[model samples]
Target: TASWFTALTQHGKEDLKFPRGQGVPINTNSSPDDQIGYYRRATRRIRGGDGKMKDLSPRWYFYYLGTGPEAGLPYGANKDGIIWVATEGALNTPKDHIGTRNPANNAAIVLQLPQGTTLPKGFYA
Candidate 1:
């Protein structure tokens, strides 16, 4: 459905192993519907020597689009931006996902999106 994902990026020389960006939409975030430049799927918290937190990692997650092993995953796309993102997980579906992934980390980031969004050079970091 054109409801969970959106965004547009270069569709070639974007991944490996086919790295990650290995399809028509390059490094898309959602299903083949959602999209991206280069992203990771999860996050990690690191503590510093002073008992502080130090961040270390790439974009949360990286992946290629497909439907095989896991099914019924919450995948949707935004036709306006031609982008897509994994709206939620199996427990949440697509319509309404409150605390679907993990009660503590489950929340929506609503944005007043503008035309053809722009991701600064290091948008993820």
Candidate 2:
């Protein structure tokens, strides 16, 4: 009963959980496999400020490795100064739920410091 397609008939159920919080650096020159960070599922329900409960949509966040205040230099003081920010929903097609002429939530801010780095002191903010 051996056939050419017999070798590919191996079947088994395998469940793998999505990696949350643990993500690759997006600002690296090298190629990173896992680019996105935490992915919030849309299964949760919450009440809004308008006194209405709604399903929370899923979201994907990214990670960026850059200069912090601890580095004793201005943010993005390096030659490869850059920042990658994740907007509403997926990275491919981001939708701005907040209606505004100038959508600040759907934007990435990159500070090309002449020379400096910084972050919050005492405790990590």
Q: For residues 36-75, what per-residue lDDT tens digits would candidate 1 score against the true structure?
A: 2222233356998999997544222222222211223333
lDDT of 1: 0.29
After superposition, the stretches of candidate 1 with alpha carbons farther than 4 Å from their true spots are 1-40, 65-71, 77-121
Per-residue lDDT tens digits for candidate 2, residues 1-125, read 01001011102222112223222223332223212222111135699999899754322222222212112222223332122322123232212221111233333323121122222122111
Query: CA shift at 79, candidate 1, in angstroms?
Result: 18
The 10-residue segment of model 2 with minimum total lDDT is: 1-10
TM-score, every prediction = 0.28, 0.19
Minimal lDDT window, size 10, model 1: 1-10
Poorly placed runs, candidate 2 (over 4 Å): 1-52, 66-125
Q: Candidate 1, after superposition: displacement of residue 40 in Å?
A: 4.7
Against the true structure, candidate 2 has what lDDT?
0.24
